[PDB]
Write a protein that binds this ligand. Structure first.
Ligand SMILES: NC(=O)c1ccc[n+]([C@@H]2O[C@H](COP(=O)([O-])OP(=O)(O)OC[C@H]3O[C@@H](n4cnc5c(N)ncnc54)[C@H](O)[C@@H]3O)[C@@H](O)[C@H]2O)c1
Ligand SMILES: [Zn+2]
Ligand SMILES: [Zn+2]
Length: 228
């Protein structure tokens, strides 16, 4: 679905014909007068007097104000109510094309005796940045692929796997930007969902044992809108 500010906001806002004489808590003008936003998106945009009720919570704003607020964020397809902090829509990312594969291997991770291991492989080729990327039309590099990572095959690890698959489909596992490890720009980097790439030790900090990891990555997934 379109992630553009006007389309996203219009998707979740229900028109109010007779708004009350109360403050829009985005622009702090009354809902019965024009939006206080005067930036570039007002020109030939949403009529400034239009007011809507947002999503399930029903909080009311000038439509133009929520368009501006959404535009000043990540524009990831999710829309947060500034009053009650409920989030509407599905957060998706800018991960480029590639493949995600997984299967079981007959080896136990440190701290998970008597288990098999879910081995996940991500493979992302180089390509051309799209309009969603920092430098559209410029090449992006993809270093160190295929990238292997590991989860124990237990109840919680399988839950994490299910959610990682969802995050992958929502283009949230990788992004295009600058590597904090190499300094290279215009390159495919891990996003904000940590993966364990070191199997039998934790000298890198990205390995095992780590008794907190599964709960930590579940929290990271929830923060990116990926929950069960
Ligand atoms: N030519 C190469 O072999 C080459 C070059 C660059 C990166 N890489 C691979 O990518 C890693 C660097 O990460 P990046 O450039 O994508 O993003 P990054 O360095 O900008 O870090 C982004 C996120 O990924 C985490 N992260 C960093 N290294 C990780 C690792 N080995 N395993 C799991 N998570 C890691 C970070 O904590 C952070 O949360 C390298 O360690 C390597 O595995 C390989
Ligand atoms: Zn307003
Ligand atoms: Zn609300």
């Amino acid at each position: 679905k379109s992630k553009n500010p006007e389309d996203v906001v219009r998707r979740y806002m229900q028109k109010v014909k007779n708004p009350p004489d109360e403050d829009c808590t985005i622009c702090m003008e009354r809902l019965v007068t024009a939006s206080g936003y005067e930036g570039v998106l007002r020109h030939k945009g949403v009529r400034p007097e239009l007011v809507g009720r947002l999503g399930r919570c029903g909080h009311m704003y000038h439509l133009l104000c929520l368009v501006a607020m959404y535009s000043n964020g990540n524009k990831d397809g999710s829309l947060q109510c500034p009053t009650c902090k409920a989030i509407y829509g599905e957060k998706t990312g800018t991960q480029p094309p590639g493949k995600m594969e997984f299967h079981l291997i007959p080896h136990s991770l440190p701290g998970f005796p008597d288990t098999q291991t879910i081995r996940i492989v991500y493979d992302i080729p180089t390509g051309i940045q799209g309009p969603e990327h920092p430098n559209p039309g410029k090449k992006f590099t993809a270093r160190g692929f295929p990238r292997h990572c590991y989860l124990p095959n237990n109840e919680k690890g399988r839950k994490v796997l299910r959610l990682l698959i969802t995050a992958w489909e929502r283009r949230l596992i990788f992004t295009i930007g600058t590597s904090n490890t190499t300094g290279e720009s215009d390159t495919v980097v891990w996003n904000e969902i940590h993966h364990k790439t070191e199997f039998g030790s934790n000298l890198t900090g990205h390995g095992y044992p780590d008794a907190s990891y599964l709960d930590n990555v579940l929290a990271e997934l929830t923060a990116q809108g990926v929950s069960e």
